[PDB]
Design a protein around this nucleic acid. Structure first.
Lengths: 195, 84, 107, 33, 146, 103, 141, 49, 146, 178, 61
RNA sequence: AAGGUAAGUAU
RNA sequence: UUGGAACGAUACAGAGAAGAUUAGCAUGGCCCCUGCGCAAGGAUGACA
């Protein structure tokens, strides 16, 4: 791309981005106040706010990575010492790793799988991802011990995970982030939460 | 010296030869050279292909189906014996 | 060097062996697929306007929207800064008079 | 075709079998006899 | 039976042993809003753990009583046009035998959108003697051609 | 309910047939002393229709202890534990020699 | 607006309607500079390629081509009209005017649905098609 | 939504006189939506049955 | 794009080191012959994506298209066809008001399932042909995990 | 309850609609068994017309439970599908006439029924001929009592005649629908 | 009928074409086409189209 | 004042 | 005989529903199993 053409395209992008940000914020304030708006307008505005919020989040994460942790060592030491003293006062035994012969290793797995199937309790048409998750849950229920072994293996050795999708529930007064995690990791996370 | 085509290459060659033979048969049937293929009927298949005629003359249908099964077996054994 | 073909039963030069195996089993339905992909491509029409039409339309739009283009600013639709064509009203009773008026307008 | 002058003495309504429509009487010029 | 905050119903629940190992369920239900894309009106409670803290039996009973009962309600409907001898041995079919088969047949967005309005075409038919009235829709009337 | 629970956490058969150059194979008729099928909670779809049919069984064969057992246990799974007692009492009045009904 | 093909006289509109035999001709009567027309034309440009198989979109300047103003009542700021095999197709939009779409539609999916419904009905031989969406209300809440 | 709100608060509704107006307005909006779905022209004496 | 670059650079550096350990190509002809192809690979990886034509939506479809039937079609129909329990699900008794079942969704209802009037004395069983199981490619991942 | 789980049925077909609810009540411990009604009347009531069943059960002084093998030795030469098809055909023929059918069942004076089983022992082609004769017999009464030609019967409706499905239509005025 | 004869002739021509060995070298294909007289390229045909044309020519010839 | 036009062949 | 209207009138029809519907076999994919061919290769039994 020639430099003058690129420069004018950049000027156009800057002007359109300024208008885009202003329009998104103005429409969001209209909706928050109670202005009567259409469904397509709401969807477009939600998309614009999602893009703006994610850009701001990228800026914030880059700032944290570049500027390091924002908690000074003295503050972290004070917090940790207070927590240690509290735990010592209450005589708290740390939660151990779930044993292979755990007395409740199956009840917790059933409880975890039930919560994952509660999203589908209301009858609805299933797409590929939903039916894949249900197949994984059914496979875990059919062979509880293999699922438990996979869960313990993930707890011990898994430190890297696949990307999770993000959407935003539009409450018309603010945006509530919603996270879509892989079902295979969802089973492990649910069992860990229950345990 | 000779050369050895790889496993993927063998799969491609076999698939192409099978498709060539299948197209040969299909165009023979299109132009009426060979009679159109009849459905392949086994015992478990008898009630799906010959279901409506196996209530009127059940044993004739059974005999016809078993004759077809034997003829399919007859050609296989004949090819094996001629090749041996 | 010379090598026997495992696909053709013929002797070929050693330097062409790789390409010989690569294109000796080119599936003919690939050629069929390419043919039908090019036959549809040739018959495809132009959805959008050509460059000349795009440029002329942009200039015509600029000649009217003087709140974006130009120096002086007139109204939204004004171009600033005899004969009236006879058109049919869509009625079967006025086909003849409209047609004759169109004929009568030829110089 | 595109970029082709209209033939002289041609009525755009005629030659196509077009028929108009009126949603009301308040829109469009008055019908001329 | 339906009195306490942890409804006495829950003591007789079939899965009352697996729920005893369910801890932190209210916090989890509250935090479910960050995983599902639909807001839960009952975010504060669980039917299995806390019981059903409300009953609409009396409400529906008094709603049928206030509308004049079955006889009063069904005079507004095409029920008397069906010539059913009585309302006892009757059942609806929520989805048609064919309408339900089309829920999964690769329909376009426009084709599917118009197929989601089929139940309404029945609803309007059910309440036609009352919706299609001169008292409720003032104006001229047009009769069907046949 | 379980003894520890706190605020915060059927149609049996009396006929048996043992199965082992003759067209006729009269197999012996055996009677089981007692038959206690599991409660089978929730296996009934139409409670009212099943209740009517079990009433019909009691009427046609008043001397069929499985009929009374299934009829009353249907009231026990339904939760109406008081009518089940009456059904068993009537069954005892009509099937006194069956120890299953008394148990 | 400036990307879609333009028809410059009444004869060209006649030929465009006559030429297509298996696709619905979608014609936007209006002006390039009209804001309503710019929104309608940008939606049409957005869906121009997707409906290539069963629709062709043209733009007609009513000031330059006032040939159909009297018969088609092309007096609204924007107008979208559908033709099939040289036959104007009406749409039961619920707006009271079945002969045309005389407003700018925001969503690009609704226009695709309208074109698809028009194509189905016209290929079935109908002269009126009921739109999948009732436009008697803008559904603003 | 209505049963969730009413069974969550159950006492705070009566004192919040603005909530009563909000609830009846929302109910009227829903009924108007249904009526517009039935027919574009709004009815004059639509029944509650 | 850095792990792939690291692998490629490591392989080419190994080749260059094997060349150098025998003191061959002292000037660096092999070194440049490898560096320029490293740059070529880097350029190829960072190449702008090519032009890909937009696929238009298929034209609306009218008429009849012959579809085959057989074991695959039978299996697909069994998986997608109406089941007896799912047949009872969409049947609602007329006039018999039922208590709300699911708290979070009042629209949800079992219908004739488990309710009197369905005409079935015994409980309907689950059609095992409608079982949910993972895809073929999801089975492959489980083989690469255990 | 007597048979083992491997030989336990999982699909019970009932030839009378009256015995659908009683089975559902008496199979309340076996939910995994589907009970299907039959709209077509199978000729299973005509097996007592056989010489080896009627007199056998008339003089039975006490109730009892007996086992028979309706497939005498067919299973050694044909599958159970053809065995059941020919059994249905034979029972339909017996239900039809029981007079000419008994004559058809033995094609030659040299064909006898051994006391072990019920039907006579025949060659495979002999059974083919007996089956075609019995099919003609079954079509004969449909031709007579309905005054229709047998040739007018398509191959699709001969199957319905053999099985036992028949349709009637007193209300032809519903021709108004078209 | 001669129609059956010509259809059978075309079918056997194609069957023979399916079993004729043709070199995959473009230079040798061009040399063979030059030897047999037919043009190297016809209406912008590709190398695969050239190979098909040579196969057809060798089948007829 | 409206958002309430069946469409289609035939003269 | 000669004009109004012709976006009308009348005549016919009016299911203005909803759709590329559905049964069989073969191919193709996968894992065996069986038989024969082809190219090689193992281990082992046998005296005068």
């Amino acid at each position: 791309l020639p430099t003058p053409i690129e420069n004018m395209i950049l000027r156009y992008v800057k002007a359109k981005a300024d208008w885009w940000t202003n329009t998104a914020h103005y429409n969001r304030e209209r909706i928050r106040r109670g202005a009567t708006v259409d469904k397509t307008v709401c969807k477009k505005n939600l998309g614009r706010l999602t893009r703006l919020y994610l850009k701001a989040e990228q800026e914030r994460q880059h700032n944290y990575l570049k500027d390091g942790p924002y908690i000074t060592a003295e503050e972290a030491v004070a917090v940790y010492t207070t927590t240690v003293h509290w735990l010592e006062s209450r005589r708290f035994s740390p939660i151990p790793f779930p044993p292979l012969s755990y007395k409740h290793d199956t009840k917790l797995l059933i409880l975890a799988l039930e919560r994952l199937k509660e999203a589908y309790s209301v009858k609805s048409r299933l797409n590929q991802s939903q039916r894949e998750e249900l197949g994984l849950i059914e496979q875990a229920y059919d062979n509880p011990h293999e699922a438990l072994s996979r869960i313990k293996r993930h707890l011990l050795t898994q430190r890297a995970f696949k990307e999770v999708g993000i959407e935003f529930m539009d409450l018309y007064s603010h945006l509530v982030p919603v996270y879509d995690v892989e079902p295979l990791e969802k089973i492990t996370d649910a069992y860990l939460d229950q345990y | 010296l000779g050369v050895y085509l790889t496993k993927k290459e063998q799969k491609k060659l076999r698939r192409q030869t099978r498709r060539e033979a299948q197209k040969e048969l299909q165009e023979k049937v299109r132009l009426g050279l060979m009679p159109p293929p009849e459905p392949k009927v086994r015992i478990s298949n008898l009630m799906r292909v010959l279901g409506t005629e196996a209530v009127q003359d059940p044993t004739k249908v059974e005999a016809h189906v078993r004759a077809q099964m034997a003829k399919r077996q007859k050609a296989h054994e004949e090819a094996n014996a001629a090749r041996k | 060097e010379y090598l026997v073909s495992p696909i053709t039963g013929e002797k070929i030069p050693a330097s062409k062996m790789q390409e010989h195996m690569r294109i000796g089993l080119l599936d003919p339905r690939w050629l069929e697929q390419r043919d039908r992909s090019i036959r549809e491509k040739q018959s495809d029409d132009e959805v959008y306007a050509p460059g000349l039409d795009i440029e002329s339309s942009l200039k015509q739009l600029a000649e009217r929207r003087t709140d974006i283009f130009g120096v002086e600013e007139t109204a939204i639709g004004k171009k600033i800064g005899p004969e009236e064509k006879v058109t049919w009203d869509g009625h079967s009773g006025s086909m003849a008079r409209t047609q004759q008026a169109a004929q009568a307008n030829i110089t | 075709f595109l970029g082709m002058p209209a033939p002289l003495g041609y009525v755009p309504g005629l030659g196509r079998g077009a028929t108009g429509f009126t949603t009301r009487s308040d829109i469009g010029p008055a019908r001329d006899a | 039976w339906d009195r306490g905050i942890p409804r006495i119903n829950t003591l007789f629940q079939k899965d009352r042993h697996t729920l005893a190992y369910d801890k932190g369920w209210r916090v989890r239900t509250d935090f479910k809003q960050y995983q599902v894309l639909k807001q839960n009106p009952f975010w504060w409670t669980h039917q299995r753990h806390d019981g059903k803290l409300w009953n609409l039996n009396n409400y529906r009973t008094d709603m049928i009583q206030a509308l004049g009962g079955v006889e009063g309600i069904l005079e507004h409907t095409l029920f008397k046009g069906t010539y059913f001898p009585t309302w006892e041995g009757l059942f609806w079919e929520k989805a048609s035998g064919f309408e339900e088969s089309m829920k999964w047949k690769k329909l376009t967005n426009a084709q599917r959108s118009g197929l989601n309005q089929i139940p309404n075409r029945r609803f309007t038919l059910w309440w036609s003697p009352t919706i299609n009235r001169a008292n409720v829709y003032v104006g001229f009337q047009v009769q069907l051609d046949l | 309910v379980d003894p520890r629970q706190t605020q915060f956490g059927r149609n049996t058969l009396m006929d048996m047939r043992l199965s082992q150059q003759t067209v006729v194979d009269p197999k012996g008729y055996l009677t089981d002393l007692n038959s206690m099928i599991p409660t089978h909670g929730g296996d009934i779809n139409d409670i009212k229709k099943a209740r009517l049919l079990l009433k019909s069984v009691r009427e046609t064969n008043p001397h069929h202890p499985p009929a009374w057992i299934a009829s009353a246990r249907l009231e026990e799974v339904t939760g109406k534990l008081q009518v089940a007692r009456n059904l068993i009492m009537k069954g005892t009045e009509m099937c006194p020699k069956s120890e299953d009904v008394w148990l | 607006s400036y990307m879609l093909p333009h028809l410059h006289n009444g004869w060209q509109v006649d030929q465009a309607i006559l030429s297509e035999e298996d696709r619905v001709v979608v014609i936007r009567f209006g002006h390039d500079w009209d804001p309503t027309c710019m929104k309608m034309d940008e939606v049409l440009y957005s869906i121009a390629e997707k409906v290539k198989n069963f629709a062709v979109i043209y733009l007609v300047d009513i000031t330059e081509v006032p040939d159909f103003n009297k018969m088609y009542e092309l007096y609204d700021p924007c107008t979208v009209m559908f033709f099939f095999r040289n036959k104007h197709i009406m749409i039961d939009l619920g707006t009271g005017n079945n002969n045309k779409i005389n407003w700018a539609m925001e969503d690009k999916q609704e226009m695709v649905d309208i074109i698809e419904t028009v194509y189905r009905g016209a290929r079935k031989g109908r002269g009126l098609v009921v739109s999948p969406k009732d436009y008697s209300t803008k559904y603003r809440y | 939504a209505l049963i969730g709100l009413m069974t969550y608060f159950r006492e705070a509704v009566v004192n919040t006189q603005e909530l009563l107006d909000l609830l009846v307005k929302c109910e009227n909006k829903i009924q108007t939506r249904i009526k517009i779905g039935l027919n574009s022209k709004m009815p004059s004496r639509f029944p509650p049955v | 794009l850095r792990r792939k670059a690291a692998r490629l650079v490591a392989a080419k550096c190994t080749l260059a080191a094997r060349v150098d350990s025998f003191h061959e190509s002292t000037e660096g002809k092999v070194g440049y012959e490898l560096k320029d192809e490293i740059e070529r690979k880097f350029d190829k990886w960072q190449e702008p994506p090519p032009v890909k034509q937009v696929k238009p939506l298929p034209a609306p479809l009218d008429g009849q298209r012959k579809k085959r039937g057989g074991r695959r079609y039978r299996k697909m129909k069994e998986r997608l066809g109406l089941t007896e329990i799912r047949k009872q699900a969409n049947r609602m008794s007329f006039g018999e008001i039922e208590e709300d079942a699911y708290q979070e969704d009042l629209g949800f209802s079992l219908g004739h399932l488990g309710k009197s009037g369905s005409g079935r004395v015994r409980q309907t069983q689950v059609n095992e042909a409608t079982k949910a199981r993972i895809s073929k490619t999801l089975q492959r991942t489980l083989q690469k995990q255990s | 309850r007597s048979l083992p789980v491997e030989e336990q049925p999982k699909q019970i077909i009932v030839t009378r609609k009256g015995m659908l609810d009683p089975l559902e009540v008496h199979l309340l411990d076996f939910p995994n068994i589907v009970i299907k009604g039959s709209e077509l009347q199978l000729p299973f009531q005509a097996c007592l017309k056989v010489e080896k069943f009627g007199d056998l059960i008339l003089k039975a002084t006490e109730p009892q439970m007996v086992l028979f093998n309706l497939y005498d030795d067919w299973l050694k030469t044909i599958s159970s599908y053809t065995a059941f098809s020919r059994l249905i055909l034979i029972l339909r023929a017996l239900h039809v006439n029981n007079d000419r059918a008994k004559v058809i069942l033995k094609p030659d004076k040299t064909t006898i029924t051994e006391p072990h089983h019920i039907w006579p022992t025949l060659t495979d082609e002999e059974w083919i001929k007996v089956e075609v004769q019995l099919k003609d017999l079954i079509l004969a009464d449909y031709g007579k009592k309905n005054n229709v030609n047998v040739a007018s019967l398509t191959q699709s409706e001969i199957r319905d005649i053999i099985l036992g499905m028949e349709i009637s239509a007193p209300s032809q005025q519903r021709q108004q629908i078209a | 009928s001669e129609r059956q004869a010509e259809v059978l002739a075309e079918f056997e021509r194609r069957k023979r074409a399916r079993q004729i060995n043709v070199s995959t070298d473009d230079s040798e294909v061009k040399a063979c086409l030059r030897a047999l007289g037919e043009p190297i390229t016809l209406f912008g045909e590709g190398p695969a189209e050239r190979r098909e044309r040579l196969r057809n020519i060798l089948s007829v010839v």
